């Protein structure tokens, strides 16, 4: 905004985004799906839910 050899001035426009939490979860586990093997009319099959 101003520039002299002994004096300056500046302006900055900052925008912020604040997330507001509804709930926070701390003690968490990932799932892993191993399923089961089945043998049927000669064919080996992997089964999963």
């Amino acid at each position: 905004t101003h520039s002299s050899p002994t004096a300056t001035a500046w302006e900055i426009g900052l925008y912020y985004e604040l997330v507001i939490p509804k709930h926070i979860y701390l003690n968490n586990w990932n799932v892993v799906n191993i399923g089961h093997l089945v043998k049927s009319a000669g064919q080996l099959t992997h089964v999963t839910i």
Binding site: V31, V32, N33, I34, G35, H36, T48, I49
Partner: peptide, 23 residues
Amino acid sequence: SLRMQHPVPKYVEVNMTSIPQGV
């Protein structure tokens, strides 16, 4: 003279547990 190798018994313990629904 006669030299022979007699088998002798031994074991290792193996434990197993289930995984409900495979999860």
